């Protein structure tokens, strides 16, 4: 089919941006730790997640 690959990898890029904003790594994140999470969300992340979703 080969078109939806690009169509949806744009959205995958946006979610990689979310990952990078929350942890600094696009896809090898290591954000979720065995005590919780490493860091708190940045102040404008929830709004952008809502806009994306």
């Amino acid at each position: 089919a080969m078109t939806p690959f690009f169509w949806m990898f744009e959205e995958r890029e946006k979610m990689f941006e979310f990952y990078e904003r929350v942890s600094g790594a696009r896809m090898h994140a290591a954000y979720i730790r065995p005590g919780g999470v490493h860091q708190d969300l940045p102040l404008g992340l929830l709004d952008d997640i809502y806009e994306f979703s």
Binding site: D40, L41, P42, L43, G44, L45, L46, Y50, S53
Partner: protein, 71 residues
């Protein structure tokens, strides 16, 4: 002094998010599509009938010119 400030949803929450499938029907019956196809076929048949009869007449005229010139 200053109160806590962290990433939290705004008061009243966020607006609703659509998640259901949305595949609207454009709208045309199978009967309608078949009718359109047959109608264009009939129009083409009629126009071709007229044009080919005219072509037959023209060919006959050319053959008459040849026959006149033959001797």
């Amino acid at each position: 002094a200053s109160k806590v400030k962290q990433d939290m949803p705004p008061p009243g929450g966020y607006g609703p998010i659509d998640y259901k499938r949305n595949l609207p029907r454009r709208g045309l019956s199978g009967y309608s599509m078949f009718a359109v196809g047959i109608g264009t076929l009939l129009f083409g048949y009629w126009s071709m009938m007229k044009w080919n009869r005219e072509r037959r007449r023209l060919q006959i005229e050319d053959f008459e010119a040849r026959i006149a010139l033959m001797p």
